[PDB]
Structure formats: structure tokens, C-alpha cells
Amino acid sequence: KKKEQLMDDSFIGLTGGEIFHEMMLRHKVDTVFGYAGGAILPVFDAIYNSDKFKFVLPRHEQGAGHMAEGYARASGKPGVVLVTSGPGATNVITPMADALMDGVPLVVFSGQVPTTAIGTDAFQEADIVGISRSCTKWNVMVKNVAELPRRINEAFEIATTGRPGPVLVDLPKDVTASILRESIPINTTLPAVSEFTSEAIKRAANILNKAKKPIIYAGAGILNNEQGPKLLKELADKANIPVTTTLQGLGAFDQRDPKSLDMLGMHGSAAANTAIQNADCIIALGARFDDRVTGNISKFAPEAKLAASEGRGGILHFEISPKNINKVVEATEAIEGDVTANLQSFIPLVDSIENRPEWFNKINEWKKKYPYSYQLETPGSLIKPQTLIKEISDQAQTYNKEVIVTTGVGQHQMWAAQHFTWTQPRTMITSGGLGTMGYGLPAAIGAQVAKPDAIVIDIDGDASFNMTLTELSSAVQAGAPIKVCVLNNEEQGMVTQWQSLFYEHRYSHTHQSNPDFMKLAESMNVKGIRITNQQELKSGVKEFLDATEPVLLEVIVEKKVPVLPMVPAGKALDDFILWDAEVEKQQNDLRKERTGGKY
Amino acid sequence: KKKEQLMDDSFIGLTGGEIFHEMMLRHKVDTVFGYAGGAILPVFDAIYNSDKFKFVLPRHEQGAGHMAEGYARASGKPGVVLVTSGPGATNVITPMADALMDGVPLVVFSGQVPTTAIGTDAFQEADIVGISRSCTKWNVMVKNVAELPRRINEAFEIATTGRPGPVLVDLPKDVTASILRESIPINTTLPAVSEFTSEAIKRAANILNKAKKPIIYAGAGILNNEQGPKLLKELADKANIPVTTTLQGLGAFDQRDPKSLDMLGMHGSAAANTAIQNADCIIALGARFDDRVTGNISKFAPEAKLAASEGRGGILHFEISPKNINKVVEATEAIEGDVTANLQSFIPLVDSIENRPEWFNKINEWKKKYPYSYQLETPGSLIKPQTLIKEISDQAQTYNKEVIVTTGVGQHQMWAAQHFTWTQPRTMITSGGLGTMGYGLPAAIGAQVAKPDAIVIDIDGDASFNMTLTELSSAVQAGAPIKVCVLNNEEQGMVTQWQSLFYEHRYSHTHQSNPDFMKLAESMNVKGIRITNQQELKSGVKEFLDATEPVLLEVIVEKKVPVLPMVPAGKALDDFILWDAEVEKQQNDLRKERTGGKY
Amino acid sequence: FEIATTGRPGPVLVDLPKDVTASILRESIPINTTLPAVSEFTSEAIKRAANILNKAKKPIIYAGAGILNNEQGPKLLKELADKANIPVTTTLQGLGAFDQRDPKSLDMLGMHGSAAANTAIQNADCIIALGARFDDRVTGNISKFAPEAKLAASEGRGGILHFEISPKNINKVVEATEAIEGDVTANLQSFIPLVDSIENRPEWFNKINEWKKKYPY
Numbered sequence A, B: 001k002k003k004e005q006l007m008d009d010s011f012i013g014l015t016g017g018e019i020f021h022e023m024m025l026r027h028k029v030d031t032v033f034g035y036a037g038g039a040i041l042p043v044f045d046a047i048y049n050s051d052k053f054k055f056v057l058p059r060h061e062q063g064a065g066h067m068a069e070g071y072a073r074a075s076g077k078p079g080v081v082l083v084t085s086g087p088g089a090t091n092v093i094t095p096m097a098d099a100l101m102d103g104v105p106l107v108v109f110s111g112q113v114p115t116t117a118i119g120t121d122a123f124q125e126a127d128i129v130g131i132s133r134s135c136t137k138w139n140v141m142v143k144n145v146a147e148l149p150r151r152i153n154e155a156f157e158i159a160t161t162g163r164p165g166p167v168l169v170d171l172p173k174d175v176t177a178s179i180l181r182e183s184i185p186i187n188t189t190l191p192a193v194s195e196f197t198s199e200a201i202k203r204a205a206n207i208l209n210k211a212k213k214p215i216i217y218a219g220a221g222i223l224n225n226e227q228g229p230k231l232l233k234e235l236a237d238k239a240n241i242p243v244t245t246t247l248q249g250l251g252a253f254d255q256r257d258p259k260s261l262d263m264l265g266m267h268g269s270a271a272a273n274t275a276i277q278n279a280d281c282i283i284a285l286g287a288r289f290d291d292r293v294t295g296n297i298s299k300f301a302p303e304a305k306l307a308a309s310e311g312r313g314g315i316l317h318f319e320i321s322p323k324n325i326n327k328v329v330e331a332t333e334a335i336e337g338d339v340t341a342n343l344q345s346f347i348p349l350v351d352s353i354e355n356r357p358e359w360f361n362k363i364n365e366w367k368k369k370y371p372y373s374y375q376l377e378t379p380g381s382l383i384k385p386q387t388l389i390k391e392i393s394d395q396a397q398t399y400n401k402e403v404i405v406t407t408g409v410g411q412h413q414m415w416a417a418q419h420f421t422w423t424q425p426r427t428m429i430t431s432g433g434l435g436t437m438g439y440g441l442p443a444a445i446g447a448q449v450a451k452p453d454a455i456v457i458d459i460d461g462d463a464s465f466n467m468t469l470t471e472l473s474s475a476v477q478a479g480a481p482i483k484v485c486v487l488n489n490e491e492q493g494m495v496t497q498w499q500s501l502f503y504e505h506r507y508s509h510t511h512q513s514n515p516d517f518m519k520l521a522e523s524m525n526v527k528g529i530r531i532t533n534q535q536e537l538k539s540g541v542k543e544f545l546d547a548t549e550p551v552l553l554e555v556i557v558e559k560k561v562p563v564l565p566m567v568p569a570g571k572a573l574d575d576f577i578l579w580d581a582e583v584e585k586q587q588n589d590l591r592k593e594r595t596g597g598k599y
Numbered sequence C: 001f002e003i004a005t006t007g008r009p010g011p012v013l014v015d016l017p018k019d020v021t022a023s024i025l026r027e028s029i030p031i032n033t034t035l036p037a038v039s040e041f042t043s044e045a046i047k048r049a050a051n052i053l054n055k056a057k058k059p060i061i062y063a064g065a066g067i068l069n070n071e072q073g074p075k076l077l078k079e080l081a082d083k084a085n086i087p088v089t090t091t092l093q094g095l096g097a098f099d100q101r102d103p104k105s106l107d108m109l110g111m112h113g114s115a116a117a118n119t120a121i122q123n124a125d126c127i128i129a130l131g132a133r134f135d136d137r138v139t140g141n142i143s144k145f146a147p148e149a150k151l152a153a154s155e156g157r158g159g160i161l162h163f164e165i166s167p168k169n170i171n172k173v174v175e176a177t178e179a180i181e182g183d184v185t186a187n188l189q190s191f192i193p194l195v196d197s198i199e200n201r202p203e204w205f206n207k208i209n210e211w212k213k214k215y216p217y
Ligand SMILES: Cc1cc2nc3c(=O)[nH]c(=O)nc-3n(C[C@H](O)[C@H](O)[C@H](O)COP(=O)(O)OP(=O)(O)OC[C@H]3O[C@@H](n4cnc5c(N)ncnc54)[C@H](O)[C@@H]3O)c2cc1C
Pocket: A101, A102, A103, A162, A163, A164, A218, A219, A220, A221, A222, A224, A225, A245, A246, A247, A248, A249, A263, A264, A265, A266, A267, A268, A285, A286, A287, A288, A289, A290, A292, A293, A318, A319, A320, A321, A324, A337, A338, A339, A340, A409, A410, A413, A414, A431, A432, A433, A434, A435, A494, B123
């Protein structure tokens, strides 16, 4: 009788595919990104004409994967991928690796050959559990239909807890075709703070209450709770602390606030970099001390390390994954768990501070000294890429709509980060840890599906865009009115920047040929706009943002322009290269000479 | 003094990148397919403006991978890939899995973050040695520059010996930037039959000399020696044996020869399938008894199994990889090693046979009974895809040039296999084991680079072509005048065929939207031709083949047409579905009714 | 415990970090976690297997450790051997599954098994393999193993009937004429009623008895 209460008969008579369909509904999945094939047909048959979720069909499964990532990042829900065996599955490996590195909850369901064929080098058989082991938090192959609901629950749970990340569930065709004939545990059919941590929070507060030069270093983890940005602001306001963010934390703090130091790191603000190198207390909120951020690790945060040794400061690391505590830099206090929940406990213990005259005097001087400067347009010159980004940023904020930005990877990505003004959470959707070129367009489609009333802008490089441009058709078929801006410098700019700097202007295979982007747009049934000169910039960007359909904007921009500031490999975070007009002129002359006028 | 003779100083003072360059030259590499990035820059700097090999730049590293596969398959040389760390490397996983399943010698060099950063979740770091372990024969991470020449030799050796296949060599940036300061073993700077096998060959010959109903089942392994097709023909002629081939063995035997039974298997000739089910001796030459070929394994080759039990026949398996001997079916005699070398020993022991009247009477009757029939065009109907393939096959054989065919994956692939007449080795370049949609275009570019004087035709499906169509730009930039024919049925035809047959015409997500292929071609700077009706077929195909530049031909073809014959899952090889005009009419009516006239 | 004891039984390991076993449970957990029919495909295979055995003139049971994994296993093995009048050999790991004092006992087969058992399996037209995995200590030269049963399978009058719980070990070494997947004892309950009772097999047991006399240890 109690047994009857704990077992469930309600799935008996359903196929594995039908059970999958029901479990999607129970997990409140409203969107699936995927692509059919022989091994996964029993599942596709079950979801045939389903009105329970939207299905989004890409042109390539890598597209499905990055779409699901963009969806997850925009929505805070897991991105669900459904693909076939063999090459359907191996085509999702880059998106899984990408999702792992950026903490994106991706739940990948891959068809598999029947259990009777596994291990025989069967038709369309890949060892996807073996291949994806290193780029997933967890994966599994389902071996019978009775365990399918359990494995689906486990996948969603692992994907969305701790540091979020990708999981894969392998679905043999005979399992999804088979019918459940037995009852299963009813729990499988449904989806306080430690004293140790409480004490660490108290000690952390006592340390911050001594600090004379505090700084908040905030990252993606603060975005994983709806109240995160609110509590970050409450802390910064209460204790009067300047705030810098990573690339992935952009939008966590209102950059219009005077306490904003903007982005730190290799291409972040020299003010932010100076401040963290001089701070006596660093409050690290959901950020992992990535090697793009720390500069030379041995030279990182010297004032905070000194303060820790003298018992008057240090690094206070609020981190959900023990793996990333004390991985790169020693935390003075490690506060384990969800940063937003732990901030609720922390802030009441923190003393309110009215002013910090000497510290904010330095902060304000550094901000004034270190803007994102660059060489402006001159008469007859091409549009500068930095100017283009400012133009899009300024005009997009006109509309009464949320604005979400995705990017490719390269210089355009860095100029997007620098020159947009970031004010809202989950509005920067960019591949940071893995750095996957081609991410921008499919991620924008996923973000647009997640947020159908948002303006979604893909700031893309021409080489990045070439990687995955076939997905323009997918945007049209999905009814996703994304706005793609290709910064066309006819080069892999990020790489040519390094070849200019370190390889004496030897541009080895870094200039790919581009298609005609306007005829390409036309072939894909998307609106095309081309801006070729300075006098077309404002009106072309307006036309781009006013469009109510998918649109591709191509902008011809200045070539061989470096992203600055730059902390070169090996250098301390405050040992940066700054923009200088005269240096840029000399560098142009040198490049011209070295390449016999070719570049 | 002997020590001096065995050590080599000649690489001292070179960077790892320069050593890589030199080892490419020593391995007679004439083409590298690749794409730059930060981790692999020291190697790109070393190969800057090299006149030692052609470098081919794709738009996506998956493209580089399939290009190298097409190159390897066309040339018989290893295909060399050079990519960066992180997503550059993970993007080559599908081509590696593809190459593993089809026995393609692929040598993949991936940049990696410096050894000082490995294992730190570094910028653009993937565990590519872990990820690629299951889809390579072998892989390695080079840990110091002194071992780089050795690891390069090992890679090429493993890739090209035994059953050929993919290998990966991971190249940390600090290793390729570092300079060799010490001498290294000189052997590292440079690139009889067993009595057991001799006895097996003698026993095999005695078995064949008893056979009354022999058949040769020949596959890809016969293509791995230049003399393979010659010795296959010598055996078939001498002992008077009919010859069937796999998909991957097409071209190994001249299909114009009366002894040709054409392709066997799931969609192969019902004559070939009948013959192998009735043969008393099966000579398996470089073929692996794939599950697309055997049909229901327990019901496969019953006459040969009977003959083996009665000591008058059986299966004689000439196979280079012990893993694939007795993996699927028991060999009566296993002859291990290179099939062509072992045929040189075998054929002299085999008795010449003038005629086999009763057997060839059956063979000839079966060939007459079982052509590749289909429903012909009717007035006003669309072009039938089978007719299109015959047209291309007939016209291509006009030219005084070698003709190499690549394909995508799906019905078009099967109709290409059936309806071309295959006569020369290494002219069918198709993804068979993994079955990767998107293969056709990049494989054609690689094949065209391998064979610059050949006509190279990609017979492609519209969904397959959408996967990787960005590589059209690559064909232009590489100067590869490939000929792409898109069979446009506006459907994933292979999958809709299964949904029609097994899922009552429920077409779940199997109709992707297509771009305008003519405007697409124009945007890519490639010539475009569109055939929309029967009266344009001959002249449009002529224009396509006459072109002396890259060209995309789109042909509008009949939709919802099944590939026949077909051996359904679970059925014996001789339990096939054959084309029947009346059945096709009923099936059309049923489809129309079920879908309310939509399909 | 579930994985260790189901399918083919085997070892499992659970690693217990010291801070986990020292830590105290502070939250509720799903109550299910606090507590420890035959397919039509298999039903059809059992029927075909019975029809094959009902044709056999020289059957032999090759029984192994799997028959010991159900308390009723040896009982059903004996019921089958008695009903259809079949001599029984066992592996090393199946010793004790059959009463070796029974005249139908051929003793152990294999590398160091009885030459009577080895002769009988090489001459049998139907081999009923009950919970045994065709180990390389048992089969001898695999290509030369069971030639009369292979011949019979090809002629549609015998073969190898493999009752096996682990799909990995079906068709791993030797091709089964019929594979009967699942617990051998449960499947024997279904099989035996379909099997014809046989009073005598004079010519076969004449050979069996001569071989036993000829080949003592
Ligand atoms: C060309 C290029 C240049 C780049 N240059 C820069 C640069 O100059 N500056 C820069 O900042 N980035 C740069 N990056 C990005 C960089 O590589 C990293 O992706 C980024 O810095 C990581 O930011 P993050 O630590 O906030 O996010 P993540 O990498 O996602 O790390 C988040 C951390 O927070 C933890 N966490 C997650 N959820 C929670 C939670 N609920 N509670 C507590 N903790 C949680 C995670 O476990 C993790 O340790 C660049 C990328 C590219 C492609």
C-alpha cells in the first residue's frame, strides 16, 4: 500500500520517445534546438507537431548547440539540444566545450545506435560518451527505458546546480523505441548555511571593515541569481566600493554609476587594472581569476597580498565551485556557495561607509587618465571600428526595448565589450573561456528566441561570421529578427594584431576572402544594409535598428588597428600598452615599409 | 665517433615551428589545410610564405578536416591539418571521427596553450588529447622541442600503416616557440610473409579451387595499393568470379565488365545481394562486413556458411587489421596483412577456370531481373533524381579527364552510388561509416587540390549542402574549380523516406528552408546554373561540365521518392523491397491523404 | 547493491571521502533513496529454440555458473535433461549444478576436462548453453569448436541455443543459432513445456557411454 504510493504506473505503455516528451514538459522546457537523423527518429516521432515547446531547426548541429547556449544565457534556463547519433553528436562537441568553459547549462540529448550495435563500429556510431567526457560536467548512456526519466532528471539537475555547465544523455534507438512495461519509482517521474561558511563570512566582513582601498571584482556568477546585481549594488553602495567586472560579468553593474571601473583585464580599462593592483581588499564575486584577467599571476594584486600578510585586507572569494577556490590565487577567506545567498548574510555584517576621499580621489584620477582612447576618423578615412560600436550603443539605447548583444571572437568582440555601456544583466552573450569564432550568429538566434521582444544585436567579425553564416536561413525559419553587424576589416584582426606586434608584420594566412555580404543576405531572404563611408554611419545604423525583420549590416571599417589598452603576455596587470597617436603613426609607417605598401 | 654518427646537430638553433616546417618537407607534404590562432602562431610564423607546400585556408576548421580527407582519398597521401587550440581543435573532431570510420589517413596538428597553462582551464584550452582519444588511432601532446621530430614521424607512420586512420599531435605554444639546444638521435630526423599466413593462403586457395559458386566482395582496402585493382581483376579473370563492391570499393572493379555485380548492401543491387546469399565461397578483399552491407547478420551468407561446414567453401577474409577479422562474421580462412601483397601469393595457387555455366547463368538472370528501376518522368513532372545522376554520369565520361565524385549524405548519395558507372580507383569519395552531412563540398575542394587536372563533382543534397556551404568561398580562394550539383528536393529525403515507411508520413522537422542557391553562388563569386524542368536537363548539365571555374548547379528534383531497392532493418540481404510502379502510385495517394495534400 | 547483483553479477566500488562520512545530513532526501514480463522477441526465440531441440538427435547441455544464480536453476536443468534425455557437461564454475552421479553426467569439459565431455560436444548436433560464456579454457581452438552443431545449424536441424543474461556475452565468441536473453532459470521455465519428452536415444547414448568408459581420469 505504501509501495503503491511510491511506485508510478502512469508511463507504462509509452515509448521512450513519448516519455522524453513528457519529461521535457515536466522540466518546463519551452524550446528545443535540434536536427533529425535515423538514430533519434523515435524521439522525433514522439515530439511530432508538439504544441508543448517551440522546436528550432538550425542548418548544422553546431548551430543548434550555440543557439541553445545563447538561449540559456539570455533566459537563465537550460538550453536543450536534440541531435542524432554519429556526426549529429560529434558536431555538438565545440558547443559543449564552449558551454563548459563559460558555465552554460546545456542539456544535450544525442541519438545513439541500438544497444545491440554499440561497440561494433556500427553505422553512424560515435563513442560520444567517451568523446564528450572532457567537455561535459557529466554524461550517461541510457540503457533501458525504465531509467530514462531518472537520467533526464539527473541531467537537468547537474546542468543547473553548482557551476552550471553542459551534460550529455546518449539515447540508443532501441531504448527510445521500446515501451515501458513496468512501474518506476515515483520520485524519478518528477524534476541552511554551514557553520564553517557562516564563520568565514564573519571573518570576511571583519576584513572588509578594515579596508581602506577596497574593490569589487564581479563576474558571471553574480548573474546566476535574479537578485545578484541588486545585492552587488547594495554592497557597493553601503561600503562605498568601486566595481570592476569581467567580460562575462558585463551588465552586472550599471556602468553609468560613478563607482564603475568598467572591465578589467588584458584589454580592459587601465583604470580598472590600476585599481585592482593597488587595492588592499579584493571582493571577488562569482569570478574565476581567468588568465585573461590576472595578467602575470605572480605580479597580480600585490597590495591585497601585502594587506593579507599584515592582517588588514586580502582577497575575499565568493565561489560556488570548490574546484575554483584557491586554484589560481590564494583566497584570504573563501566563502563557498551561491554568491547572492552568501551576500545576503555578508552585507549586514559590513559597516556602512560614507566617504573614502583618498581612495576615490585616486579612482577618479585614474578614470580620467585612462579612457578608451583611439585614433579618430580623419577626412576621407574609413570608419573606425571603435566609432561604429559607440554609434550602435548610443542609438540602440533609444528604443523602449531590452537590448542584448552577442559577438564573434576577435577585435570586434573586445571593442564591443569596451565601447557599449553595459547596464542590465544577461545582455552580453559572448564566448569568453573557449573563444569560439562563429558563436555570434547562432547565439543571437537563441537569445532572440528566449527574449522575443528584445533587440538582439550580433556584433560580428567577418572571419567569425564566415564560420557559421549558413545559419542566417535558420533565423528566418525560426522567426527571429536578429540584427547582425559584420565589422568588415577583411582580416582576422586579432591575429594580425599579434603578427604586427610580435612577428614583424608577417601576416601568415590571416586574410580570408569574404563573400558579397549583401548578395549573401539577399540569398538568405534577410534584409541587407551596407555602410561604406563615414557619411553613411548614422543613417545606416538607424536603418539597421529600425528594421523589424532579420537584418545584416555590413560596415567597411579601418584595417590593421590594434585593440588598446593591452596587457601583453608576461606583464603585470598594471604594465599596459596605452593608445598614443604618434606611436600609431609610426607603426603604420613601419607596417607599410615592411610589407612594401601591401598593408 | 660512432656517437657523432648517430646524433644530429642540424636542427639546433631552429624553433619548434621551423622544425615542424622542415619535417613537413621531409615527409613530402605538398598541401596543408588549416586556420590560424594564438596558440599555433609560432608554427604559422615558420611556414610564412613557404614555397614548400600549398596552404589551403577554409572558412571553418571542419572544412579543413573534410578537405584533408578528400585530399587523402583522392591522392592516397595523408591529409595534413594545422589548427589552433581550443575551438580550432574541437572543430576538427567530426572530421577525425569521420576519418576513423572510413580508414582515412589524417594527420591533425593542433596548437595548444603553453605547458605552463595546461590543466588550469586556460584561455582557449581544450583537453583535445582526451576528447580525440576515441576518434583517433593515436594521439600525443608534444612536451619538448627535442621530441617534436620523433612525434611527427610517429604520427605519419601510424596514420598510414595498418588500416589507415587519423592521428592528432598537440603542440603547446611554448614548445613550438622554443629553440632546440641539443642534439637528437639522427633516426628521429628522418621519416617477409609469416609461415602462419603462407599456410592460410594455401588453404584458402584449396578452398576456392573447390568452389562452384564463388563471389568476390571487394572494399576500400583494395584501393590502398596502386596494384590492388589490377590484382583483383587478375583473380576474377583467372578463376572466373563475379565481383561486387561496397560503397567504399566503388571504382575498384570496372563496372562495365560482365563479371560486375555492382554494389551490394542495404541499397545495393538485388542481383549482388542475391548472389552473395547464394555463393558457396566469398572472397572478402579489404572490406569489413559493415552493418549497411550484411543485412541481418544471423541470416547473412547462408550458402557460404553451409559450404564451410561441409568442407567445400566458406569465407576467405583478406584483412590488414586483426581487430576486423572475425569481428562480425567468422572467416573460414583469415589472411592477415595487405590484401594486394597477399593476392600476389594467392593467385598463383588458384586454378584457372574457363567457364561456370550454371553459376553465370544464375548471375546473368539475376542482373537482368534486378536493374536499378524507378518511376520515369512523365509529361510535366519534375526531373527524377535518378535520371539526373544518369545524365551527369553519361556526360562526364565525354571529357578527356579523370572524373572524381564526392557526395553529401542521404538519398542523393545512394543514387550517385547506384547510377554512376564506376570504372577507376579513388573516384568515389563519400562519407560512409560515420555518414557526415556537409562532407561533399569540402571533400571536393581537397580532392580537386590533390588532382588539379581532374573533373571533381560534388553530388550534394540540399540539407547536406546547407551544413557547410560557407566553404564555397574557400574553393574560389584556393583556385579549385569544383562542380557542385545540389539535388534540391527541399527535404531531408533520406529521413522523410523512413518517416513515410515507418512513421505513417509524420514528417517531424525534416524540411529545412533553403537559400536562393543562385544568389548564394553569386555572393560567393561562383558561377550558378539552375535547372528547373526536364527540357533544361541536358543543356544545363553540359553547361555545368563545360565550366572552367567553380560552379554550382541547382536541380529541382521530384520530392518524396524512395531509394530502392532497400533491405529494411532486420531483414536478410536477399529479403529486399523492389521498385514497383503501382506500389509507388498507392504510396503517393496514401501520403497525399495522410498529409491532407501537403506532401 | 543493485548493479552488483543484477544482470551478470559483479564488483562495484563506492569511494567515501572522509568529510562526507563525517558530515551530518541536514536536509530531507527522496524517500525512494532510503530503501533498497518476457519480451515478445524472447518468447519467440524460446519457441524457435524448442523447435530446434525437438529435431536434435545428438543434444548436449553445456551448463555454467549462471545456472547457480537462481535457487531453482539446478532443479530446472535436471528437469530439462530428464525430459528430453540429454547428457550434461559443466564448466569449472558450473561444477555442482548437475549431480555427477547421474548417468547423464559427462563431467567437466575443456582444456583439462573429460575427453568424453570434449568428444561429445564436438559431435553434438544441438548445444544448449546454459549460463556459460564459452571461455577460451573451454572451447579449445575456436575455429574448430562444435563442428557438428555448426553443420546442423546450417542444415536447419540443430545449432547452439544460448541462454545468457548479458548481451555482451551473446555472439561474443561463437554465433548462437538462437539467443535467449535474460535469467536462464526463468527462461527455462518457459522453454521446458515446449520441449518434447524423449524416452530413449539409443545410438547417442551408446556413443556417450562408450566415450565415458574409454576416457576416465
Ligand atoms: C579575445 C578575448 C579576450 C579576452 N580578454 C578579456 C579581458 O580583457 N577581460 C576579461 O574580463 N575577460 C576577457 N576574456 C574573457 C575571459 O577569457 C573569461 O571568459 C572571463 O574573464 C571569465 O569571466 P568570469 O570569471 O566572470 O566568468 P566564468 O568564467 O563563468 O567564471 C565564473 C566563476 O563564478 C562561479 N560561479 C558561477 N555561478 C556562481 C554562483 N551562483 N555563486 C558563486 N559563484 C558562481 C563559477 O564557478 C566560476 O568560478 C577575453 C576573451 C576573449 C575571447
